[PDB]
UniProtKB/Swiss-Prot annotation, chain A:
One of its GO terms (molecular function) is structural constituent of ribosome. It comes from the Bacteria. One of its GO terms (biological process) is translation. The gene is rpmJ. InterPro entries: Ribosomal_bL36, Ribosomal_bL36_sp. Belongs to the bacterial ribosomal protein bL36 family. It comes from Staphylococcus aureus (strain NCTC 8325 / PS 47). This is Large ribosomal subunit protein bL36.
From Swiss-Prot, chain B:
Belongs to the universal ribosomal protein uL3 family. HAMAP family: Ribosomal_uL3_B (MF_01325_B). One of the primary rRNA binding proteins, it binds directly near the 3'-end of the 23S rRNA, where it nucleates assembly of the 50S subunit. This is Large ribosomal subunit protein uL3. GO terms for biological process: translation. The lineage of its organism: Bacteria, Bacillati, Bacillota, Bacilli, Bacillales. It comes from Staphylococcus aureus (strain NCTC 8325 / PS 47). Pfam families: Ribosomal_L3. Part of the 50S ribosomal subunit. Forms a cluster with proteins L14 and L19. It comes from the Bacteria.
UniProtKB/Swiss-Prot annotation, chain C:
It comes from Staphylococcus aureus (strain NCTC 8325 / PS 47). Part of the 50S ribosomal subunit. It holds the Pfam family Ribosomal_L13. Belongs to the universal ribosomal protein uL13 family. This is Large ribosomal subunit protein uL13.
Curated annotation (Swiss-Prot), chain D:
One of its GO terms (cellular component) is cytosolic large ribosomal subunit. Belongs to the universal ribosomal protein uL6 family. This protein binds to the 23S rRNA, and is important in its secondary structure. It is located near the subunit interface in the base of the L7/L12 stalk, and near the tRNA binding site of the peptidyltransferase center. The keyword Chaperone does not apply. GO terms for molecular function: rRNA binding; structural constituent of ribosome. GO terms for biological process: cytoplasmic translation. This is Large ribosomal subunit protein uL6. It holds the Pfam family Ribosomal_L6.
RNA sequence: GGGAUAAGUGCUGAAAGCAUCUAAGCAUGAAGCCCCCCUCAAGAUGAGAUUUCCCAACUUGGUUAUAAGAUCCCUCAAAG
RNA sequence: UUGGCACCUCGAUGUCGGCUCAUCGCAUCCUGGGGCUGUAGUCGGUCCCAAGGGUUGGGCUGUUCGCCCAUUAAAGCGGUA
RNA sequence: AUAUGUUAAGUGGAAAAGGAUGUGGCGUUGCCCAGACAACUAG
């Protein structure tokens, strides 16, 4: 997961969710994941 | 798991089947007898108390430790043994095989058995830092007035004490040391001697406790 | 110096009580017991002497925590050796030796003065449900409020 | 079939086996029930919806259990045993031990075709998550333990 | 070797008919965290345990020698 | 770090570099665990966890730096007057 | 202590641009049993 302060969906397949108390991207593309 | 007490007699060479030259320490274990069975029942934990070398007479009315005192008399007499001069526990024995009155004998250690050996470590006196922690000396020459002193002992005004770890001069020789993994090389049942591969920490005549290796 | 009772060692009696931690919050059982221990509960309270009663806290194991702190509340300790801090223990204290979790926790609510010290030595905490001290014949006591 | 025990809403299914916790503090309905959408009060609606979901997932597999299938897309493939699948998988230089009898878990052997064969989807999902854990689907020549019907993206050497 | 964990990988899962490692609940996972390994350690005043040893004369609580047991002193060293 | 300010010390708070001894932080040089990869393999890049331990001998210069010779798994960065 | 609500971060008990279906209130609106959101079947 790219680890960044900002979190937005990357592409129109992406979905945002909290998972440990942390907001995270779920784009399904292996090189498009995120977790603030 | 097994163990015996023994007096370190000293070092020799001995020869392997391959001509291999194996340094050996000669441990001697005449006369060890089990003296007490320590069960969880009474003692709270499991141990066999073995009494090493034999010592004199009775509550005989005299100066030395060589002669046993009434407390020892009664302790040995509960075990139908003559009074002994060294006594130690081994926890981590088989605690059930071992009935109280019996001898342990050298024959319990079989050749090629790998073992750990405890014993207190020779004895240097009050000693300087270079001898006791190996610390490099200061330069000689080049105008130095520093040779065998332990270094800076601390910080400036921040660590404004000397930290509790600090290492400096004093007594060297105490401290029990055990050394791990040494082969039994031979066992000489005729004189109760038992040969140990390598060197065990004693001075000489030091009591050492051999026990079955852990790990 | 008109009138003002001060309790002597002649003029004072010390009762024994048993407390069931099972079902209680750590801090609340702790503070209630501390006042019990200081005698701050009798009308004959007097500051320069140990006026308190004995407390045996029971089933220390069943003590509880409020927050998400079975894991989040660490106890530290330092060995006075360099870098020998010891973070260890959380509500792991309640797992092994909770007798100390309750003991030290209660004792941190008594004054650090030799009197307060003797006062702390009047507590007895057992994780199990069976004190040795039956001979002192403790009365069962219910947590107020 | 339609047989299940009850007490304190922690009751075993009568067929085969069960035992499970409830979150308690919730509205409950007999047989199939419903209302995954809302119940009781507040945003505890989520929790109760998970309760109905869990018990429903429980009853759904007790008569006809669901079983994940795992295919070994490589030149090596696991054999079989009465308590293990004997995963001599991929080409790591040793066979691995695996499997457990907990609840009910069947073996499988079909030349690179294996299956967990449990009851509830949680135990199956677990033992197969780990049966598939031993080697992974490396996305080139697609090799590796693979859940059946899994997307397996690839790329160019 | 065992236990718990991080980043991570997940399972089951609603909120949010789907989907989702997570909020309930589960599994996995590091030279690191705990136990294991080595030495110290009951002045742990919270002063622990086991085995053995000794055992009265006087008393207006105590008194005094003694016992088990040591030590002083003396010959010493593996100790200093 | 270079500074700004002039609050402690002018009836004195020794000062660069080295040497001796270290101790701590993590923004990790190596080693352990992973994600992405424009990751085939062998290597690597980059981020994430991790501070247990380790982290070299010389040529020139007072030097700290720096260049260089030769090795290393690596030749980490800072605090502690 | 009382009454009514909030907060689940030990926030309380250090910090910004920026970021998030975290929850609470107060409003305004467009599609809704003429069937809509979502899911599944047909280009
Ligand atoms: Mg970052
Ligand atoms: Mg996690
Ligand atoms: Mg000398
Ligand atoms: Mg709790
Ligand atoms: Mg205990
Ligand atoms: Mg103080
Ligand atoms: Mg567990
Ligand atoms: Mg003492
Ligand atoms: Mg006492
Ligand atoms: Mg003592
Ligand atoms: Mg003399
Ligand atoms: Mg030094
Ligand atoms: Mg970086
Ligand atoms: Mg480190
Ligand atoms: Mg160290
Ligand atoms: Mg160099
Ligand atoms: Mg070179
Ligand atoms: Mg490498
Ligand atoms: Mg350098
Ligand atoms: Mg440094
Ligand atoms: Mg604070
Ligand atoms: Mg600004
Ligand atoms: Mg803010
Ligand atoms: Mg809002
Ligand atoms: Mg709102
Ligand atoms: Mg309107
Ligand atoms: Mn040197
Ligand atoms: Mn001088
Ligand atoms: Mn000199
Ligand atoms: Mn100085
Ligand atoms: Mn584990
Ligand atoms: Mn679902
Ligand atoms: Mn004692
Ligand atoms: Mn009398
Ligand atoms: Mn005598
Ligand atoms: Mn001699
Ligand atoms: Mn400055
Ligand atoms: Mn000034
Ligand atoms: Mn001014
Ligand atoms: Mn002065
Ligand atoms: Mn001065
Ligand atoms: Mn870090
Ligand atoms: Mn790595
Ligand atoms: Mn370091
Ligand atoms: Mn309220
Ligand atoms: Mn805070
Ligand atoms: Mn903002």
């Amino acid at each position: 997961m790219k680890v960044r302060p900002s979190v937005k969906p990357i592409c129109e397949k992406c979905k945002v969710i909290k998972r440990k108390g942390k907001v995270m991207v779920i784009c399904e593309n292996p090189k498009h994941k995120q977790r603030q | 798991t097994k163990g015996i007490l023994g007096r370190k007699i000293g070092m020799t060479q001995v020869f392997g089947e391959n001509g291999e030259l194996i340094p050996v320490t000669v441990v001697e274990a005449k006369e060890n007898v089990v003296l007490q069975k320590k069960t969880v029942e009474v003692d709270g934990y499991n141990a066999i108390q073995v009494g090493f070398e034999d010592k004199k007479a009775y509550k005989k009315d005299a100066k030395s430790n060589k002669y046993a005192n009434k407390p020892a008399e009664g302790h040995a007499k509960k075990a139908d043994a003559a009074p002994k001069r060294f006594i130690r526990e081994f926890r981590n024995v088989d605690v059930d095989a071992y009935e109280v009155g019996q001898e342990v004998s050298v024959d319990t250690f079989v050749a090629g058995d790998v073992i750990d050996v405890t014993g207190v470590s020779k004895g240097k006196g009050f000693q300087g830092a270079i001898k006791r922690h190996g610390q490099s000396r200061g330069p000689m020459s080049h105008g130095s007035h520093f040779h065998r002193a332990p270094g800076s002992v601390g910080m400036a005004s921040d660590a404004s004490r000397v930290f509790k770890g600090q290492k400096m001069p004093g007594r060297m020789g105490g401290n029990t040391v055990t050394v791990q993994n040494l082969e039994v090389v031979q066992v000489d049942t005729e004189n109760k001697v038992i040969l140990v591969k390598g060197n065990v920490p004693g001075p000489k005549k030091g009591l050492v406790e051999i026990r079955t290796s852990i790990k | 110096m008109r009138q003002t009772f001060m309790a002597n060692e002649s003029n004072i009696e010390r009762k024994w009580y048993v407390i069931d931690a099972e079902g209680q919050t750590l801090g609340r059982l702790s503070s209630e017991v501390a006042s019990i221990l200081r005698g701050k509960n009798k009308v004959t309270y007097t500051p320069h002497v140990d006026t308190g009663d004995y407390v045996i806290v029971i089933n220390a194991s069943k003590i509880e925590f409020t927050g998400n702190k079975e894991t989040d509340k660490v106890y530290y300790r330092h060995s006075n050796h360099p870098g020998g801090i010891k973070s260890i223990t959380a509500g792991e204290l309640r797992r092994t030796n909770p007798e100390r979790l309750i003991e030290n926790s209660i004792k941190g609510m008594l004054p650090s003065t030799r009197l307060g010290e003797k006062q702390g030595k009047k507590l007895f905490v057992y994780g199990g449900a069976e004190h040795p001290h039956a001979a002192q014949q403790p009365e069962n006591y219910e947590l107020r409020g | 079939t339609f047989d299940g025990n009850h007490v304190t809403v922690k009751g075993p299914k009568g067929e085969l086996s069960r035992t499970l916790n409830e979150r308690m503090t919730f509205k409950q309905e007999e047989n199939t029930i419903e209302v995954v959408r809302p119940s009781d009060s507040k945003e505890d609606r989520t929790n109760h919806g998970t309760t109905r979901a869990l018990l429903n997932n429980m009853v759904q597999g007790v008569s006809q259990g669901y079983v994940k299938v795992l295919e070994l897309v490589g030149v090596g493939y696991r054999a079989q045993m009465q308590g293990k699948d004997l995963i001599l998988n991929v080409g790591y230089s040793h066979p691995v031990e695996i499997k457990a009898e907990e609840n009910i878990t069947f073996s499988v052997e079909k030349n690179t075709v294996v299956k967990v064969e449990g009851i509830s989807k949680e135990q199956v999902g677990a033992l197969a998550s780990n049966i598939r854990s031993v080697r992974p689907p490396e996305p080139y020549k697609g090799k590796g333990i693979r859940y059946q019907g899994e997307y397996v993206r690839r790329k160019e050497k």
